[PDB]
Amino acid sequence: KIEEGKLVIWINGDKGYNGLAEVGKKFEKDTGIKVTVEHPDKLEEKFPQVAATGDGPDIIFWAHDRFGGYAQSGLLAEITPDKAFQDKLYPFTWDAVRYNGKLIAYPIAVEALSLIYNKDLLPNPPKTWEEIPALDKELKAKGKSALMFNLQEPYFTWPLIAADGGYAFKYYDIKDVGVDNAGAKAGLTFLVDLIKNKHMNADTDYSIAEAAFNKGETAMTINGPWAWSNIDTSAVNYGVTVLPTFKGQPSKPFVGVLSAGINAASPNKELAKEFLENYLLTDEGLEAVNKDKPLGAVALKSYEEELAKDPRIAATMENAQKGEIMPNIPQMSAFWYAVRTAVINAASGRQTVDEALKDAQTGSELYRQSLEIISRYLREQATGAADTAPMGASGATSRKALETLRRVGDGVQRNHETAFQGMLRKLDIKNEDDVKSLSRVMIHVFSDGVTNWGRIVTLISFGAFVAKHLKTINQESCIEPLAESITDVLVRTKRDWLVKQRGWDGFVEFFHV
Numbered sequence: 001k002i003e004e005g006k007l008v009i010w011i012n013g014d015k016g017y018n019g020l021a022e023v024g025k026k027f028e029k030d031t032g033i034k035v036t037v038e039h040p041d042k043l044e045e046k047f048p049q050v051a052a053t054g055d056g057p058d059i060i061f062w063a064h065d066r067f068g069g070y071a072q073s074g075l076l077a078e079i080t081p082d083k084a085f086q087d088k089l090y091p092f093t094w095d096a097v098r099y100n101g102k103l104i105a106y107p108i109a110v111e112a113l114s115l116i117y118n119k120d121l122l123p124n125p126p127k128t129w130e131e132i133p134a135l136d137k138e139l140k141a142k143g144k145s146a147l148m149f150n151l152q153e154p155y156f157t158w159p160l161i162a163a164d165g166g167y168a169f170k171y172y173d174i175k176d177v178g179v180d181n182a183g184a185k186a187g188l189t190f191l192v193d194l195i196k197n198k199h200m201n202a203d204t205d206y207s208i209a210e211a212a213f214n215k216g217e218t219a220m221t222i223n224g225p226w227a228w229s230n231i232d233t234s235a236v237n238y239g240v241t242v243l244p245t246f247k248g249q250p251s252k253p254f255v256g257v258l259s260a261g262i263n264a265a266s267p268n269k270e271l272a273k274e275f276l277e278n279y280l281l282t283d284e285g286l287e288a289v290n291k292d293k294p295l296g297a298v299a300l301k302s303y304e305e306e307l308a309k310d311p312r313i314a315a316t317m318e319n320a321q322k323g324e325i326m327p328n329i330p331q332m333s334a335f336w337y338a339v340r341t342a343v344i345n346a347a348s349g350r351q352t353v354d355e356a357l358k359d360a361q362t363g364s365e366l367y368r369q370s371l372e373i374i375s376r377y378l379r380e381q382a383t384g385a386a387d388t389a390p391m392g393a394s395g396a397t398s399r400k401a402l403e404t405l406r407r408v409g410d411g412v413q414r415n416h417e418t419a420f421q422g423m424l425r426k427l428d429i430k431n432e433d434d435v436k437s438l439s440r441v442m443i444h445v446f447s448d449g450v451t452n453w454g455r456i457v458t459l460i461s462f463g464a465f466v467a468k469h470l471k472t473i474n475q476e477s478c479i480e481p482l483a484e485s486i487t488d489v490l491v492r493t494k495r496d497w498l499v500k501q502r503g504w505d506g507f508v509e510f511f512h513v
């Protein structure tokens with residue numbers, strides 16, 4: 001389905017795609033291979049959907065956080081640069097694109113948010129978030145505002161949520177999520193109070209914030225290096241500086257490494273490798289992109305030495321040092337989708353801060369919490385003995401959902417023994433290969449009819465029945481992948497229903513004696 005003898009590239013619309021296309025023309029001139037650069041809307045959502053059917057671009061550019069998800073789904077070619085090419089880029093950029101010991105993309109540049117301020121309106125930018133309300137009152141009396149930034153993407157609010165101890169995953173422990181802790185609460189509350197006191201508007205998005213800054217209407221914005229081009233064109237006299245502190249502690253932006261992955265379904269992997277290594281990741285390649293839209297601190301040592309003398313890059317790396325490199329684990333997508341909803345609902349007043357971050361924590365934890373219950377149930381049902389290991393500090397829900405599942409699920413397997421036996425015989429489960437086939441059948445079953453806890457118990461109960469069969473034919477190693485696949489079907493298709501029911505707390509409540 002992907003065309004051979006051509007390269008199709010996807011990069012986000014905020015990046016230097018015209019610069020990338022010039023690197024495309026230079027590749028074409030030397031090789032006769034035409035490079036097409038596109039910047040589709042929502043390309044980070046659209047890449048996994050199309051790559052999963054063997055379609056999509058040859059090369060996808062995004063920050064590294066989304067790449068572990070793509071790799072886990074088998075959408076990325078492993079990349080195998082030799083040592084001499086590996087030595088040309090900073091090792092911490094290679095660390096960003098390493099997943100289960102394999103390099104799954106080419107690192108391009110380090111991106112961190114900074115405070116951007118209008119020197120003509122604000123010769124001394126504020127050192128603290130706390131002084132912004134008084135600053136705004138001062139600027140409002142002159143027909144100006146203190147601060148506008150994109151409130152529709154959690155990326156921009158994360159530095160404030162994280163300042164006082166909010167975090168995604170403790171360093172990575174997927175069982176330790178910091179989304180609804182007191183630090184996160186205090187940061188998002190400060191944001192909601194800015195909106196309440198009319199210092200910020202809940203509806204401000206990327207476009208509105210950028211135009212207000214670039215027209216001289218607001219003294220400050222929060223943005224990455226890619227934004228500096230449009231500000232150059234605007235004639236605003238701007239500085240790039242350290243983000244304001246919150247409760248005496250630095251803002252902690254999530255650091256992204258813009259990265260180039262190769263589609264596992266691409267029949268042009270050698271052309272893509274040849275383009276990325278010998279045309280893009282060179283002084284002339286990164287300069288062409290950078291001249292269009294600044295990349296940040298580039299992964300290529302030679303060109304990073306030239307760019308590091310720029311104070312805007314110095315300020316970028318200062319904010320980076322005070323932040324954290326984003327995780328690349330597959331959970332990141334669900335984390336971002338949850339926190340995006342929480343910031344928007346808290347900002348608009350649809351939910352209180354406590355409600356919004358509670359739901360975001362449940363969303364962020366949903367996959368791992370589901371897998372822990374389902375996997376323990378399938379394994380104890382198969383072997384006749386429970387797992388003795390502790391769930392941990394935050395798994396009272398896990399213990400109670402498993403106790404509920406045992407009590408309710410005993411009945412379902414006994415009543416459906418004959419139906420389950422027939423269905424198991426009608427399928428041909430014998431190994432890991434057959435377990436992959438099961439996912440289509442289970443999705444197929446879960447795409448028709450009503451959503452309720454009884455139907456979920458029936459799916460898991462079928463899972464336990466299959467796990468018992470697997471154990472009997474010495475295929476015990478297939479039980480964990482079965483559990484992964486049942487968990488996948490369940491959260492893909494029912495994520496929002498499960499968050500609405502308060503996840504597994506709802507399941508315990510619904511069947512409570």
Ligand SMILES: CCc1sc2ncnc(N[C@H](Cc3ccccc3)C(=O)O)c2c1-c1cccc2[nH]ccc12
Nearest residue numbers: 416419420423441442445449455456458459460462
């Ligand atoms: C992969 C098999 C699976 S997983 C699964 N998960 C949830 N629900 C299912 N079915 C119930 C309907 C139902 C009730 C009793 C007996 C039979 C069906 C529902 O849709 O609510 C199934 C099935 C399934 C589907 C059709 C025939 C089947 N016979 C054995 C299992 C099974």
Ligand SMILES: OC[C@H]1O[C@H](O[C@H]2[C@H](O)[C@@H](O)[C@@H](O)O[C@@H]2CO)[C@H](O)[C@@H](O)[C@@H]1O
Nearest residue numbers: 012014063065066111153154155256336
């Ligand atoms: O808003 C959540 C979002 O944050 C990051 O996306 C950034 C991206 O890294 C930057 O390169 C720039 O394009 O702005 C984006 C924010 O709108 C994560 O990389 C992304 O996965 C996540 O969804």
Ligand code: NA
Nearest residue numbers: 012041042043
């Ligand atoms: Na976007």
